[PDB]
Amino acid sequence: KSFVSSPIVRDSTLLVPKSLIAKPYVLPFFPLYATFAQLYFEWTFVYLGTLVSLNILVMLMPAWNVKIKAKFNYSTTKNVNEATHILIYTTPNNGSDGIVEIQRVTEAGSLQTFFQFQKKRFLWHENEQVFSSPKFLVDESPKIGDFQKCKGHSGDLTHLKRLYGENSFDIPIPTFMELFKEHAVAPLFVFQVFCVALWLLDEFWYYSLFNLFMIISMEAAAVFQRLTALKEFRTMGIKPYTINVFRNKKWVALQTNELLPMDLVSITRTAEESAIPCDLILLDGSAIVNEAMLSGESTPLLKESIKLRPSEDNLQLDGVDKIAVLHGGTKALQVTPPEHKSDIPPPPDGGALAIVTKTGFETSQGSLVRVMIYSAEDNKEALMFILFLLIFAVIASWYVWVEGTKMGRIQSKLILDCILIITSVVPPELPMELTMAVNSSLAALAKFYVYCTEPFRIPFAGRIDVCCFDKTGTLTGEDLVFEGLAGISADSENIRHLYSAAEAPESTILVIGAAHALVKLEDGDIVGDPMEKATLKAVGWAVERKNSNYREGTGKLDIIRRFQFSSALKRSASIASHNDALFAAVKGAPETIRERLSDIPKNYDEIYKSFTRSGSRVLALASKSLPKDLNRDDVESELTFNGFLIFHCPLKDDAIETIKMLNESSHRSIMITGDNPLTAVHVAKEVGIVFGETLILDRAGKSDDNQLLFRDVEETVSIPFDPSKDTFDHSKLFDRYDIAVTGYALNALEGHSQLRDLLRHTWVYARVSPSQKEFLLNTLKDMGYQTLMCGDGTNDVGALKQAHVGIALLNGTEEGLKKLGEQRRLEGMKAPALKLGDASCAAPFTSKLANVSAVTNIIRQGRCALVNTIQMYKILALNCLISAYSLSIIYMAGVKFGDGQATVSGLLLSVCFLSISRGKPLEKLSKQRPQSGIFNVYIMGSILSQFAVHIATLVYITTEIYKLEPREPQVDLEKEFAPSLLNTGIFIIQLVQQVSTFAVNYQGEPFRENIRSNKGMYYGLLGVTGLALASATEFLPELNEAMKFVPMTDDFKIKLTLTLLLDFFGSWGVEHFFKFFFMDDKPSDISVQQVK
């Protein structure tokens, strides 16, 4: 039969669809139905009931597991020409099993069986009788001649389209039905449908159907909201744009979707909100790409051609020959056309030609995103809560059943009472309360443009212990900006000195403008390295169509001849002229220029090493006077120092304050970047992640043998280390220095005994691969900490997915977003745009703004959400216990309430219970963290003690009332409501208990705003308290008479009032007692900060 051959699959069996008659559940049942019909032609109806139930269950058994579905519905076969479905048994580390449909199509006279599993294509090869995925040429060892000699596609490529597919990134979104099926498993929903069914068993039809409809509508709205969020924010921004392609020996302009491997393209200077299509390789030309999105580094890399290499012997290595590859998802800042002629004509544009190698999801970015999407992977608190409620309901039901069978009532009424207890175990307004809370949290988050697609992760942001960060794009910008000169002095009064702008002497402002490669076109434009343009604008130079540049504010200047920038001996030059005389400007790397000029300054080396060891990328320029077309070694014979040029990506104006606020709030913040260790350490020290001296783990030598070395930022201390013999001496390393581990040191330390002791004491990780951030976050989660990740690139997509709460920062300002919203509103009535990228595809939260304080806002909302959840759970527990006791004990006595009393009390207390959720958090972050879960000594003790206080109060007052009036031993449960004294003596105290169970437990000061600032609940409690205290002391005889209350004596009034006050005060006091003695709100051990 078939045998799929791929590292994703493990086993595979074909499947043929069985008819509607041969299904396993159907054949056996007809004999049972015939037997039941024969026996029928009371007690027998339950048999038909359970038979129908088991039949319907057999039918729904398949849908939960795909293995059971494939076993029941389809029967395995051994002929690939007749099966129409195939089961795929995936490997342990790749997703889950599934069923994929075998498609067929006839092309060129031959049918081509094929399907597609996990966005990875498969095809049918008859020679080996296996479904084999395509293998590209670049993966197989290629001779470089195979790439050099290719001449594009020719003929009819109707087979390549089938074998490789279209270069398209289409991510699937889940349908509404599966998303609803995910929600319809939750314990609350199944409990609600179970209880409404139990009630429908005997109650009315209209009320039950209305309740069921109101339950279904909430889930419908929730799934609609989540599905809209998914549909908007689950995609990578990829828009096809026309490029030239060499097909049929002529340059014809195709789109980006119709690209195949071994196709000649001509890439130009990439415009805004666009990227390189797919994995290309330079065949001729040059470029300057920016790997900030995919690789995650700041400096723009310089790519070169592949033509000069020998053709026959050498092999395409992707080692030494890494300077020619171009990934997909990076921007090309500058491109140069090919120099000499080849066997193909040059492109019609000014671009450079290159070869495609991989397309679609098989490229690097596509592979990362696909492995994130498909290869992906507590509820015990809710389960224990349900079991607790059920235990107490069962106790009460046993008591009421024994008492009923002792009194002599029929079984039907006892069953109805035991059903009513379990039906009333939970308030009816719980779904509306939960929906209101979720919608309020979402609409409060969405005012900072923070859209969330999984609302059940908002409570996760309350107890965050570790906050991870990405450097490039998240904390700093991704472009180099001109900072100012340096080093043009001889006083040695201060090394780090930046002549910010326009403070240079005449020589430096002449040289900065004479030594460049920009040029103005005829139609009006400027081309060149954007950093050169940036410095030429910052100094204030203006280039014209003629190479002469002027209008700087002092005069004019013209260029005679300019030179190129070679990869080796990296530098440039230029020959300019002025009104006075003629000079020659030179601008190149500092070390190469240093050997060139004669007059070596004194602070040259010091300034170079001081500005290069911390992030910045210096450029040392020099000049020389030239008196009145010549060689290159003559103009660069000897020069004169004229100044530096310092470029570095600038911090976000919001990072320092956000990190300080997260540090002063018992959080631990670390940095996981991809840049070199020096820049990472510098930015982490400037922001406030590390404080003291910093050590770095990196390779000791160059070649091999896995020997790490603790080395300072400078050359002061060099502590050697060996991951084979030595071990971390904590007292001498971790106490005196904050260390930062690189990627190679983290790779050579795998399997070490103290790897976790290392990970506990490192705050900065530099030069890590996109596959090691996942390992770091998985280890931090396995240790026991709660994690967070805030990035923007494509390399940190797996880390964003694996964290407990992920955040993806897009680009955009407040003004631009407000203007876009206003324009959209105006268009519906009658600044650069934002790109969705690949980080927003995996992160649940997606801050459409660019600033970093989104992390602080999300944590501030998560604290409030968690507090609301805990308070609601505790109040539900108390109300359940009180209602169970009330029913079980009271109802077995002669206590029945009127209608108006119950109506008013229910209205007011329901208003309060619905107003529980509404509460605005405080603008400050505190060091105390909310409690997680109800089940612990503090909350359980508080609940049980408050229940005990209420029981004691109620027992005392019942004894007092039975002292006033006779006990009436004989009781009947059919007598209607009648004004009595037990009635009022119980009702007033029920009201006061329901007031106390809110007023004592609601108040949370450090996490959200006070109760008085919650006007709804405050006014509700005030109204109910006024009602109770006006009914207790009969302050208003008209109100007491209007509500069917019996007139009381004086001593009983005094006793009742004192009992109410003592009940409330004792409850509050014992709650405060447990809160003071057993709070236990402790920050994590890693969160504490000590002076090293």
Ligand code: BEF
């Ligand atoms: F530099 Be980060 F990995 F985006």
Ligand SMILES: [Mg+2]
């Ligand atoms: Mg980034």
